[PDB]
Symmetry: C2
Subunit: 169 residues, 2 copies
Amino acid sequence: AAVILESIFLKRSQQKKKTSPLNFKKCLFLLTVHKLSYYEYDFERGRRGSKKGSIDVEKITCVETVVPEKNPPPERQIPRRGEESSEMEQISIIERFPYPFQVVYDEGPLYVFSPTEELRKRWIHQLKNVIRYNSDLVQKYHPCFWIDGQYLCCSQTAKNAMGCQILEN
Amino acid sequence: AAVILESIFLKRSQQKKKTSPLNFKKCLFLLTVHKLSYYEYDFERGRRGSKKGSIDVEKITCVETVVPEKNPPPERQIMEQISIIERFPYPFQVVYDEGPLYVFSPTEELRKRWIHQLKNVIRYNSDLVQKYHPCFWIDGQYLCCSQTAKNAMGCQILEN
Ligand code: NA
Ligand code: NA
Ligand SMILES: [Zn+2]
Ligand SMILES: [Zn+2]
């Protein structure tokens, strides 16, 4: 299969850590019609390093945006309403990741932060395409992050809880 | 001073001997009105690491493009987040007494911005040259004129 998309995103850890040990780490994400996988990125050698995870596309049930953090650190803060920039800013495209989206499957939700709105859209559209004929697609989801033992949107404590919001219209 | 430009470029190592195979290393480059410095880029830390070098701006005598290598490997063969940090096809040179310094940019636009700012910043220097070497110093001599001294006067008149 061909690699449909390849990007460096900031991935939130799943952990099982108290003391709000939420980790955000940059990973190289790859998408094919069969799997969404992620790896460490070997900057010096300019290639992907060891595999950190893999999700078979058929197990994905939902992919949508996530309501952003209320007061995120500067590296995840959403830029100016403007741009008109006919040029991708090299540094910010690998240092700032303000646009989160979620990939929902069996093992709870995976949260991914994109450096740009365009790129997040590109990934959500393509993921929606590759999961289109999946057996267990859900028509509800949690619009907000799961943090500190519960979803911010409905306060439920189970990660596999049915979504509290019906999709689109 | 304020940072005028910040970019990750592929830097060519100074060829120690005429038989030494060329080494290229990605470095974070910073330009201010006083210095042009480069550091390792700590990807995981998302910031500059150990300083690798610095060039006093007052010491720069010329900044121009360099004719590219004829058959470069994939990494330097002629905006997508990945290619902008993995592919570096556009070279430019910073000339000074202890130079030249060869830097490869991922894009033509970025190289154009750096050359423009560097020219701004060296504008009032006392030893600016009117001639330069259009090609790389390779395996012991400049490809452009065959002169074997890196500090040799440039073989081409700089007509802007
Ligand atoms: Na690559
Ligand atoms: Na920075
Ligand atoms: Zn909810
Ligand atoms: Zn020459």
